[PDB]
Every structure is written in structure tokens, then in C-alpha cells.
């Protein structure tokens, strides 16, 4: 009865060829024909088809494709191959080989709940939604294999293997020789990529007081390496049972996703306009955390932390650091954690936390509750030698620390503040802050913001621009002041660490203006900031 | 030179229409007389004038003889068999696109006509691509023959001219570098 | 009001930038005033060996040196690289090597003609072979919508831009007829 | 600057192509003045008479400068274009043989019987030519190998051989073969110092060149060319095909051959300057060719308006650079102007 | 000669002028005739009392087409003159010395001279007055159309033969035959004279 199946198969190929050629949106717009031609010349051997367009063209083959996908879908792939040959011939010399094309599907329906796939839906096309929770490494699967007999060396070529997580059984005895005599040649088989994923149902759809359920997914060729854990997806695929009890899995036919370092001349002109302004440094310091009152010198210090100094390597190989580090002390209140969260949002790379020290090469780490590493701060490296291990972890970053209160580690911080009788001024602040929170309750009921402060999306891009492009130095006249200041303070706790910290702060201030050189102006502002911050620790405690 | 100017030149061709209005005198265009019009009696006018009347419901357009399905199949057969480009009617693709755009009510067997025109365009495009790729491997000559190319096909393929101009400089540099 | 006829590419910014590049060269000791290295190149003292003063100089200056001098080929045009590029250049990133590849090669041939005719002819043959291996790929690559031309030379960029312009025009004309 | 003489100076470098340009039409062209291609058409006994004049010029084994001329100047044109060559294959180009100068000529598969019998004939043919050159009375001959060109000649006797376009590797290989030629330390102290302290001791290019051999030392070069696999290509389009030999006087297994000739008319811009072009291609352009072609022009009186000169050009002579340096009787030239009163060239 | 012939000649002139890389001999005579025809038809329509009828719309659309052709031709020639004005004057004087047809009309020549003076003033005020006395001459680039290719179609019956450079040996040249329906990819300087004579249409 094989000729009847051959007649059915060739009829299906004829109808799918007619669908790919004749479907149109009016005029000369044959969308699938044009898409197939563009994909083939782009060297992407794939096509994507909408089943509602197919249902409007012919209802019967669409219904058959849904109910018998393992029988009907290879005919559609074969029809796509034939139409691609017709479209592209005569191909140029060297490109005579005809490639093999993968067909994918889309479908406009409500997805089925992952808990409510009926047992009648085995071996049928279904649509499911969820979250990707895990993703394995890509592996190879054999499509066609060559067999040879162990004793008499007779061969069976081009034995084809069915798709999915299915095995296949070898011939038990020789066709032309003991039990199970055939072997598989490693050199004369064809292979394609595949990948396994795991899908979790959406937490919105879990019934109250229960854990979510899971399903395993199988993907092939162009559908591999398309997703990462955490992604939200909708999937069209065949519901299958893995080879009287079996576990189920889904063979994927279509995925739908439910979700810097480059600039325009407009962006460069915007950055340069802000750099050309005289009040740019004060404007950036004002733009840091506008919801939190006051703290002007602290906001200036955080701007210096974000921009940093230059980084140097002399001919003998000893490097000089560019990072800057800041510490905050005093009462546990006054929105310290909100300042740290703002720096975490604004910084090009960064982390907030209460190891963690490693994870920010070129970035910023905010540490709360610091009263809970000396090598990490100075050497930008930590080391270990315990039983059976010795390694070193190296990473470059700047650190902002908040404490609630060792005298040893105070040497490692460039700037220190003590936050500390507010009640009369705090009455006006209470009026403003409670008016803000009642306005937030009422709410519950692109360089500039509306209030003149800089936007976060512009500020983050501008910091990322400046760090990769400015790189300043000091003028000799700027260098001449620091020598006299150092000698006077030391011969009226003065150290070379403090001198290099002042030099780094002066370079950081000159970076924001996009200067070639730092001058006496930047040195004097750096000295003012250093005195105002550090002498609080000399006066207190 | 671009596709809009190609369509502009293609508008000067003549085509036959059947008016429903009537008029007594001729119309003395600078491009020559076209009238008079009698209702139900066909006559020949320019393509731009035909489309202008068809938009105002003043006539019915009669398609060219080469838009018959048998004639299109003959053209496709010759284009498939010949190694070079086969010969076509003047402004073939432009007149096809203009009439499908503005007068598809009057074309007969519209989908079959449209599909055959798309087939002819596809394989002529492949022939031109292969010829240009095989030319750009050359170093021995700066000449090729491209008989029966259409104006819009020539307009779409101007990268080859720039590539040949760039190749000639390096060839001249090698000739001047040859010692004596 | 008097007129001076000049080169056809006198005002070309790309040609000025191409002339502004520099190559490694060597000059004979004592045959030139050592004021030259401070006067033209801004170098206080030449680096010196048994063969001569060793420096880098720009092409605009090197054309004016009617005295004796010698040229060393840069890294991108060294003979091992010539063998590599002549073997297969169909997918290599020439812009990573040099943004003015063919232009600097033609300048090097014109300079090296008096010192080393065989090396000059060998480099010219290499340039012709390298461009022949890549022009068809450029003209084909221009037809994709997602192409952005990252790897191409300044000379190849002209062909790429013209091809993409033609593709945009014909696609815009076709999509009226829906 | 310009250099000049009464007659054409000799250049001994063999070239690949000759082109001659004139403002006066050639005899077979005179019907036409429109732009187009013209056949070089010969008439009656002209080719046979030119062949007679050629063999009579070279009958003694060296040139006789006193033979009477033919009557048709077309026979002078024919006699200028002839030479003898071995080996023989129809449909394969046999010059130039340096691998850098081949365009990609097509593959030709051949039987081992054909290649073996060809090599067996080649050894006898080459030995016969060399015997008649050294101890007989032959003038000169050329050999074009895959790596170099060689010339054997006599000084106006003393014998001289010249080799051209060699590498340092080929020079050292000939040294290992035992040829001699008149071609154009502190590290030991450092190693000694290291060994004296007890530190462990484990702590020429010159481009392309020519060579000249005098006298009795030529016989070593003869045996080297007989032997080496360096000159007998074992891999490529010229697999197992022996080197080419060329002469201007007959030798055993030598085949008589002729250059390809063609001609064109160009017209431009409504000017007086129609231009008439003659080409000779597809073989070596030996030094006698230019000398006879000068006589073809001067016999047919194309110089009569000497205010409109005629120019001649010979190409690819740099592959054989050096063959005219060993004497004051020769010259390097590439482009030449002919008049009746003089012949001129550049200082070069 | 009819206006129906003048318009047909003008269209072929417009196509050749767009395709050619340099300046063809001027054809402002046909432009002046067609502009006068536009004005005559405009005044004739202005004498009509009834305008909401088919004839007036057909006439006005034809005037639209003719105005487009003439305007685009003049714009292309002005954009060519602006690239190098001194060289255009030089080529016109050389054609006059050779006794050939005009490259520029009188108004085009006047425009070229006035634009050249206006362009000279900016360079003299910005740079050249500050130079040393040897460096005060005005630079003028040479022509640049040496290696340009065209697609060309043959229309005349008896065109004959053409010569092109030989890329195998650039000392010499190769001869081609042009059969009277063919299309070629060819250098422009080989077909320049035939494009002037109207035996070749550029594409
Ligand atoms: Zn068996």
C-alpha cells in the first residue's frame, strides 16, 4: 500500500508549493516568496509561516498539519526546498549545491495552561507560555548514518533517523554474521546542532500556596542559543512522550520572546555642550540624587568617585591606580542606602550589597552596613593559602562604603565624612518631605529633567563616554603648589598616600570638563574637598 | 538616473482605450493629436493619458497583446532556454507595474499574469548577478556585452561601474611598476 | 589673478590623510644635516646604527628627499603577510591592518622603484591579486539589509556605498505597488 | 638624454614581444584609412624567398653580413621572423620558462612513453649542440630553464657563458655542483668567553643576480645542466618536460618555426595622425630580428618624411638582464627611433 | 520641423546628459522653443471661459511633464559647471579653436565667469592674501574623468569600429566591432564622439 502513501505525500508537496508561491497581500506582494529569496541570499536556510494565513489559503492542510505534524511537516520542508531552487537558479559558479531549509511556525491563539494539557493532545501541536530556567550546552545529533557489517563488510547507506529525543534500532541480522553485527562509521554520517532547555510555568498562573511545575524542551538548528535563563517566552511545539509509563517533553517549532560604547554626532554635540558650560561640575553634583536634601560636598565627592583619575604604567612596570574610595560615618539614618542605590543605578557597572568584592572589573561597588580586604583595596587583588589551595583573584574597581559607627583600614579610603541639631531646619525639611510623600500618594491615587537637573539616561552615557576618552595630566604650575602645601603641613599624619589621593581628585575634577590638563583651579578645589572631608576625622573621635 | 525617471520615460508609450465620454474636435497636444473620442469605439493614446482617464472613470483600458498568458509562457520558455538575456517588449516591467497599480480591474487572468511576470524577473535577475560576478574575477579585459538588457535593469546595477573604475587604477599601477 | 594647475585630487580630505601617514626609513650618516630631525620631525637626536640613522618619516616629506635614503616595509606589507594575503584574502579584515591599504601600497611602490625594482613589482602584483579576490564579495554583500561594511578599506567603501544606494532605490520603487 | 648612431646597436637580451608604430601605411594596407584590423597578406614566392635568404645568411654557423638581398621586401619581413627550437609539443607554449612569467597555460596530460622518449632524445640533442659549440665552429645558442636563462657565446678565440636571474640558493647549488664564476670574528670570541667562564654555549641575499663563466670552467656548467633535478621540473604544468633550446642555424631534432604576425589601423580626432601598427608575438625575439626589421623599413622608404619618425619597441628583456654587460660591443635598449640617416635611443 | 520632433530630440538629450560624466555640447535652443510653447498654451487656456472639463486637465498635465524635463536638464548642467568652473571655460575655448560646436551657451558662459570670480574672492580673503609672494597663485585641479565606465546601446546602423585600452599590455589598444543592436559595458572616452554624434544612447 506504499504507492497510496506516495500519492498522499506528493499531493501534500504540490499544495504546499502552491501556498508558498501564490499567497499575497495584494499587488505584487508575495511575502513568503520574497522572504525566502532574501533569506537564501543572506545565507540563512530557514523560513517562517503563519498558520492563520495558511488557514485562510486552505483549511484542510492546516488542520492536517496540526493533528499529524510528524507525518505532514516534512512535506512542507521539502516544498520549501523545491521553491528555493526555482527562485534562485541559475546560481553562480561555486554555488551549485542546493541547501536544506528549516520551516518554523507562528500561531495567534490563547496559550494553554501548563497544568491543563490534556492526554488527548499527545503528538499534536500546542502553544505554551513560560519562563526559561536552565539551558544546557549545545550538542550534535546524527541525521543520516552509514552502516557496515562486522564480518562480511556489506553496507547500508543513508539510514535516516527521526527527529526529537528518539533512538533507533539497528538491523538484527545481515541483509546480504552473528547477532547484532552492524557498526556505524564515524566519518560518513551527517550531524546537526541540538539543545535541551527547561521551562517553568509563570508565577502569575500558579494557584495559591503551591510550587510551580516544569517541562523539558528540545530545540534544533537555528532555534539553538536563542534564549538565556530568566527569559519570558511563548512556544509553539509538538507534545511528545519520551522513549506503560513515559515522561513528556516538547519538541519546539517556534519561539517568541516577550521582552552603549557607540554614539551619534548629536550625542557628541550634547556631551560637548555640557562640557562647554561653566557650571558643569556644580550641575552634575546638583544632579546627583535630587530627592535627598543638602549634602553638597558629599555629592561632589560621589561625582569624583564616578569619574576617577587617570591610570598609569611607567617603563619599569610599576602601575599607579586611578580609582577613588569614599567612606561615610555617623547615624544609621539620613537616606544613606538610597544614595548607594542611586550610585548603583547611575554607574556604568556596579553592585550594591551589605566573593562580592571580585565582581566589578572597571565598575563601582556600594557596601552598606560596613561595620560587619586591605590587600583588595590597595593591591586590587586578594590572595589565599589554606590547606590544598593557593590562588589570587584580581579585579579593578572603586568602592563607596557606608558605616554606622578599624583605625587600620581608614588609611585605604581617600575621603571620609561624618554625617552628624536639625530640628528648626528639619521643620522645613519635614514640610517638604511630607509634601513629597502626599504627592506620591496622589500619584498612587532628553538632557534635562523638568526641574533643570540632568537625566539618568544621559548622565550614564556621558560618564561612559568620558572614561574612554579624556585621560588628563597636571600642569607644572599646578604641581608647584602641592610641594609647598605638603612641606608646610608636615613641618609647621601627612603621607604620600594623601598626596597621591589629592592628585587623583584633581585629575578627576579636570576629567568632567573634558580638559587636556588640570590646573591650579582644580588643585584648589581638590584641596578644599580633602580638608573638608578628612579633618572631620581629625577633630572627632 | 533612477526608477522614477525610468517610469517617467515608460509613460510615453502608446496604448489603446475605449472611451465612455465623447468629444467632437481632436486634442492638439505638443506631442501630437490624439482625438476625437467616440463612446464604445477604441483608439490609441499615451499611457499617462490612459491612466489619467481611468482614474476619472472616463474610459476602459485594453491590455497589451503580450499580457496574454500564452505569450507570457512563450517569453518564459525563451528566457529559460537561452544562455543570455532574451528579448522583451519595450518598458516591460515598468508598464506591467503601472497597469497592475492603476488598472487591475481591466486585466484578464490577473494572478496568473502577475506570477508569470515575477518568474521572468527572478531568473533575469539571477542571470545578471552571475554575469557581474564572473566579470569581476577578470583582469585581462575591461569590456563585456549585455544584449537585451532593460533600462531599469541597467539602472539597478551601477555598482559594477564603480568597481571597474577602482580596479583600473591598481592595474595601471602594476604597469607603471614593471621595470625596464 | 593668476592660475596654477594642480592635481585632480588636490582638495580630497582622504588623499590628504593618506599623504599624512608615515613609514620606517633610514638615512646615511653625515650625508644630511642633523638639524633635519629637529627641524622637520621634532626629534632631538637621531637613532643611529652601522647602517644609518633610523627614523619614521611622512610620505609628503619623503617625496621631497632627492638625497639618498632607504625604506623598510611596514608590518602589513611584509613578505610573509604578502604570501598570506596572496594565498587567501577573501574574508580578512583589511581595515584592522590599514584604513588606506591600497593607497599606501601604491605610494610605497612609487617610492621603492628606485631602490628595489623587483620588490616594487612583487608588491604591485600582490595588490592586484588581493583586490581581484574581494570585489565580487563586496558587490554581493551590499545587497543585504543587515550589512554594515565593518571590514572594508576606504577604497572598497565607495563600491559598498554605491551598491547599497542602488538597492534602497529599487526596493522603494517596488514597494509602491501593493 | 638621447643617444644615437648610424645603425642599430646590438642588444643580446631575448624578449617576448615586438611592436612597431608608424605614421605611414604598410604595403598590404594601402586601400584603407578607417579604424580596423588588417591581415598581413603574403603574395607569390615571398615566403620561400625569405626562407632562402635566412638560411644563406646563417649557413656557416655564424652570420655572413655580405649576402645579397631578396627582391621583394616582404621576403625581408619573413626572413626576420624565423628560428629553430626543441622540444616539440603542439598546443603547449614553450617560452617564457621562468615560473613567475607564465600566465596559467592549460594542463596537458601525456603518456610516460612520450615523456621518456622525449628525455632520451633531449640528452643527445643537447650534447650535439654543445660539442659543435665548444670544439666545432657554431656561433652561439640559448637555453631557457624553469629558473634561469643561459647564453653560450664566443668573444670576438675565447669562450664565454652567461647565466641570468639567479637566486642565492641557485648560486650555492651551483657551488655544490662545482661551478666557479666571476661574481659581480667577534662571535667566536663571545663563545670562547662564555666557555672560559663556564657559561653554556647553547645560551647573503643580494636580490636577483647574473653570473659569468670563462674558459675551461664552462664544462662543469654543461654537466650541471645535464644532471640536476633543479632544472628538470618534477611537479607542475611542465612535469618531466626538459628545458627549451633555441638556435639560428639547424641542429638535429630542431624544428623550424615562425612568429605570429598581425597589424592594425587607428584613426583619431580628424587629425592627420592615422597610426599603423605591426605586431610579432608568440616566441623569442632573437637579436637578429630587429636588425633585419630595420632593413625592411629602410628598404620600403617609410623614412622619406624623416620629420615623421617610425618607432620600435621590444618587451620583457629584464628577465634576461646581464647578457649585454660583458662587452663594449653590446647595449641595453628598450625603445628605438628609426630614420634613414640614424637610429636613436634613450640613455637608459 | 515640428514641436513633436523637438520634444522627442530633447528627451534623448536629457537622458544622455544625466548619464554622461562630463559636459556635452549645449542644446539650449530646444529648451527655448519648449518654454515658448508652454507660454503659448498657458495664454490660450487663459482665454477660455469654462475650465471644469477634460481637455484643460489633459493640456495642463502635458505642460507639467515638459516643465519637468527642461528644469531637470538645466539643473544637471549647472551642477556640473559648479564643480570646476575654470576647466569648463578652458574646454569651451579649446573647442572654439578646434572649430567644433559650442560647449556653453552665452548665458552659461556668463554664469561660469561670475561664479568663478565669486569663488575666488573667498579664498583670497581667507588664505591667499596672507601667503608669501610666491604662493599667491590660485590652484585649479586637472580633469578627473579618465577611468569612468558606462553602459551604452548602439542605435545607428553603420557605427563601425571602436578602440579601447588593452589591460594585458597597456602600451597598446584593442579594436571592437559594434553591431547595430548591441549593449556594452565600456569606457566613456571610447564612445564620447559617438555620443556627441547621437549614434549611441547611454543607459
Ligand atoms: Zn554480514
Short mmCIF file of C-alpha atoms and ligand atoms in Angstrom, two decimals, chain A residues 149-154 173-177 181-182, ligand 1:
data_model
loop_
_atom_site.label_atom_id
_atom_site.label_comp_id
_atom_site.label_asym_id
_atom_site.label_seq_id
_atom_site.Cartn_x
_atom_site.Cartn_y
_atom_site.Cartn_z
CA UNK A 149 28.53 -5.42 8.73
CA UNK A 150 31.35 -6.52 11.04
CA UNK A 151 32.23 -9.78 9.27
CA UNK A 152 31.31 -9.66 5.57
CA UNK A 153 31.61 -5.81 5.26
CA UNK A 154 28.30 -5.26 3.44
CA UNK A 173 20.92 -9.87 11.18
CA UNK A 174 22.81 -9.31 7.94
CA UNK A 175 20.93 -8.34 4.77
CA UNK A 176 23.38 -9.98 2.34
CA UNK A 177 27.23 -12.77 10.71
CA UNK A 181 26.64 -7.42 13.59
CA UNK A 182 26.31 -3.87 12.22
ZN1 LIG F 1 27.14 -9.75 7.03
#
